[PDB]
Ligand binder design. Structure first.
Ligand code: ZN
Length: 161
């Protein structure tokens, strides 16, 4: 049975999010923002201008919020990157959490990190693992808010298949 230990890790290059597909999410804004924007799928679309925003117009969802992404490939995750909405926006996310999985059923948490609404992208040194599914979650215990928006999520690593 496996365990959590030390490791050297190169600084893996990014992955093509072309094949990808979010297969579930707690919440998204299907109108409020743009009419092609705010969606969960914006998180992984390669478009800077698109962002996911939690539902806010006409109702909102209680925290926590998560988004599970199917990476079509088995990948050795090394970093995770989040492009925040930034540009002075009210985006009071304070804590995000990442988990990951080879099959959609058993998850291992790969880190809990502080969030900052900087324009520049957020490099997160997750716990490296072999995984096909990452789950971005926004916990109900960070001092997080029902306002949460993210332009892009990327995964730096190497193809292990
Ligand atoms: Zn986007």
């Amino acid at each position: 049975d496996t365990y959590t230990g030390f490791c050297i890790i190169k600084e893996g290059t990014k992955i093509s999010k072309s094949g990808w597909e979010v297969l579930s999410f707690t919440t998204q804004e299907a109108s409020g923002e743009g009419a092609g924007n705010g969606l969960a799928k914006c998180l992984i679309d390669g478009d800077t201008e698109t962002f996911w925003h939690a539902k806010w117009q006409g109702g909102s969802d209680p925290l926590p919020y998560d988004i599970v992404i199917d990476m079509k490939q088995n990948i050795q995750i090394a970093q995770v990157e989040l492009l925040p909405r930034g540009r002075g926006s009210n985006n009071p996310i304070k804590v995000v959490e990442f988990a990951a999985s080879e099959d959609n059923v058993n998850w291992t948490p790969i880190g809990r990190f502080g969030f900052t609404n900087q324009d520049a992208a957020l490099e997160y040194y997750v716990k490296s693992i072999k995984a096909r599914y990452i789950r971005l979650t926004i916990p109900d215990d960070g001092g997080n808010s029902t306002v949460a928006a993210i332009r892009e999520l990327d995964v730096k690593g190497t193809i292990i298949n």
